[PDB]
Amino acid sequence: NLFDYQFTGTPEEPIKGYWTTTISYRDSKPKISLTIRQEFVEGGVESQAVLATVVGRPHLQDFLLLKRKHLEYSDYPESIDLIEFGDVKVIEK
């Protein structure tokens, strides 16, 4: 495949109540990655997204593409599907 993947923690073994997954464009430097942090709340899972990227990129489209890969890789895609671009923290290196 064409993406790099990592995770730290899981829903069954969260790290201080959180777990995170990161998916990135292979060989990106400065790195293009989307990190999704999840935690249990009453009735479901709450997701927060950070797009680490670079000045000039089409952040919306990068976000949408990495979001689709997160949907296939996460354990609670319904919670990630709710994230809209306006909610994403964008860090341009």
Author numbering: 1800 to 1892
Show me the paper's own sentences about this structure.
The two genome segments code for four viral proteins, the nucleoprotein (NP), the glycoprotein-precursor, the small matrix protein Z and the large > 200 kDa L protein which harbors the viral RNA-dependent RNA polymerase. The L protein synthesizes two distinct RNA species: (i) the antigenomic and genomic RNA as products of genome replication and (ii) the shorter capped viral mRNAs during transcription. Here we present the crystal structures of the two terminal domains of the CASV L protein: the cap-snatching endonuclease in the N-terminus and the 326 C-terminal residues, which, by analogy to LASV, might play a role in transcription.
To further substantiate that L-Cterm domain 1 has no influence on the conformation of L-Cterm domain 2, we crystallized and solved the structure of the isolated domain 2. This structure was refined to a resolution of 1.8 Å. CASV L-Cterm domain 2 also crystallized as a dimer but—due to absence of domain 1—with a completely different and much smaller interface compared to CASV L-Cterm. Superimposition of the isolated Cterm domain 2 with its counterpart in the full CASV L-Cterm structure shows only small differences in the loop upstream of W1818 and no major rearrangement of potential cap-binding side chains, even though B-factors are relatively high around the putative cap-binding site. Co-crystallization of the domain with m7GpppG, m7GTP, GTP or ATP did not result in additional electron density.
